[PDB]
Amino acid sequence: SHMCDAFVGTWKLVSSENFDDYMKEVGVGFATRKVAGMAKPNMIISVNGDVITIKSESTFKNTEISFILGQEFDEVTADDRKVKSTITLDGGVLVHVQKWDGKSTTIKRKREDDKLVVECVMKGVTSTRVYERA
Numbered sequence: 001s002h003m004c005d006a007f008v009g010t011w012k013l014v015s016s017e018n019f020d021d022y023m024k025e026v027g028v029g030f031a032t033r034k035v036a037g038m039a040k041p042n043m044i045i046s047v048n049g050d051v052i053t054i055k056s057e058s059t060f061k062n063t064e065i066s067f068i069l070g071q072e073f074d075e076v077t078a079d080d081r082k083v084k085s086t087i088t089l090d091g092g093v094l095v096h097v098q099k100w101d102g103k104s105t106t107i108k109r110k111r112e113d114d115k116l117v118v119e120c121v122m123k124g125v126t127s128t129r130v131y132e133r134a
């Protein structure tokens with residue numbers, strides 16, 4: 001047992017707050033914001049050795065990242081940004097930093113009760129997205 005076992009599984013979006021404004025701050029255009037905001041993703045998290053895989057599946061896009069904690073990777077985001085990402089575990093929270101064009105955004109994933117809470121921060125704007133087990 002490890003590290004992320006409390007994250008592993010299949011998770012479904014149950015609430016979102018301030019996601020349109022988060023997306024505006026990251027630079028997402030109108031049409032992508034409207035369709036992305038309407039998405040109801042499932043989040044599938046798995047671990048195999050040192051490799052963590054996170055899949056986000058929705059009607060708008062299916063995206064998947066695999067990574068090793070602390071080891072930077074190049075990522076293409078849902079909104080088609082090319083970013084440099086690093087994911088670490090800090091005090092039981094998965095912290096995902098994306099860097100591009102001299103900007104930065106941080107996505108934190110934490111277990112809280114029976115939920116997986118995703119907090120997304122860009123400049124002063126926070127979005128909170130709550131998932132429960134599927």
Ligand SMILES: O=C(O)C1=C(C(=O)Nc2ccccc2-c2nc(C3CC3)no2)CCC1
Binds near residue numbers: 022
């Ligand atoms: O995993 C989550 O809750 C989180 C996100 C998400 O769900 N995104 C999406 C899920 C389906 C479809 C589209 C998106 C989409 N995100 C974005 C830009 C904001 C990045 N453009 O489209 C993004 C942050 C964490």
